[PDB]
Copies of this chain bind each other. A is one copy, B any other.
Amino acid sequence: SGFRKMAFPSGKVEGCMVQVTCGTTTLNGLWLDDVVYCPRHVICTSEDMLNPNYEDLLIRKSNHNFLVQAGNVQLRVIGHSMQNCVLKLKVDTANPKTPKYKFVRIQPGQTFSVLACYNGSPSGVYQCAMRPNFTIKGSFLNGSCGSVGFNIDYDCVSFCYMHHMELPTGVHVGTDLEGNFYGPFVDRQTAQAAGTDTTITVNVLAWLYAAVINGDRWFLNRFTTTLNDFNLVAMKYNYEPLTQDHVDILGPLSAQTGIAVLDMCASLKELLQNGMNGRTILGSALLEDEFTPFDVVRQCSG
């Protein structure tokens, strides 16, 4: 038993991380087949970053201006292109460690593992949820751009995130591997708002199910509610409204515990209205919303 925020084993991705330098700017690139993907602001000087014209900036760059290092091994760049907010550098050597992989655009409320990297070398791994407002709450310093987020399904790595920027609020934003930002963000160093940060209701319920599965049951009560009644409470508390699809997604957990979803909703409502009274649930004194139902099932079944 026990329930912990858990990342995927990162070895398959470690073997794809490279260092990309252009001028005095260094960040990380992702090397798959004979293509290296990285954030296009690798071409900016610190001055260019306030209002970059990326087309003009790129035009002064040639292949030999992109220095790509895999370990101590330098790679030969034979082509370059800009796709949205990422550069694709064509190299002359296919990565021998390329895993089976795909590029995917995750949906808000889904989770993925971040392999935080500096100078092309992995630093650490941790789980993140793509929040409803298309931000993530990570740990990123200067030089971490190009670090990627991923999921693993048996042997296939699904890359879903590349890191680009930190907002004034301290939350983190980035793109998919086609270089389209998640959310209303642009890669320029100007103040940018993410808007209200709502709570992922179906994930809170999943984590309450995980809590019950793991012996934490004090918050259960004799009440039930309706979807429309509950959702009127979610409104007040900036929770996402619950839908039958969410109910259906919770089915396996509902059946595996014998607690109707709307009975669990009634417990959540009382927690939202009455607080936790200084108690904890799965070691936390707040309601946790960065576990998906799949996260809870995968971890409660190995």
Contacts and interface: CB of A to CB of B under 8 A. Distances in A.
A172 B100 CA distance: 35
Contact of A11 (B15, B118, B302): B15
Contacts of A142: 302
Interface residues of A, number: 47
Counting chain B CB atoms within 10 Å of each CB, the highest count among A11, A116, A300 belongs to A11
A141 B4 contact: no
A199 B139 CA distance: 25
Contact of A166 (B1, B6, B125, B166): B1
Nearest to A142: B302
A195 interface: no
Interface in A275-294: 275, 278, 280, 283-286
Nearest to A11: B11
Tell me the number of copies of this protein.
Answer: 2
A167 to B, nearest CB: 10
Contacts of A2: 137-140, 166, 170-172
Interface of A: 1-12, 14-15, 115-116, 118, 122-126, 137-144, 166, 170-172, 214-215, 275, 278, 280, 283-286, 299-302
Given A3-B139, A6-B123, A9-B123, 13 more contacts: A1-B166, A2-B137, A2-B138, A5-B5, A6-B125, A6-B126, A7-B124, A7-B126, A9-B115, A124-B299, A141-B301, A170-B215, A280-B286
12 contacts: A1-B139, A2-B171, A4-B126, A6-B116, A6-B126, A7-B125, A7-B126, A9-B10, A139-B299, A142-B302, A170-B214, A284-B284
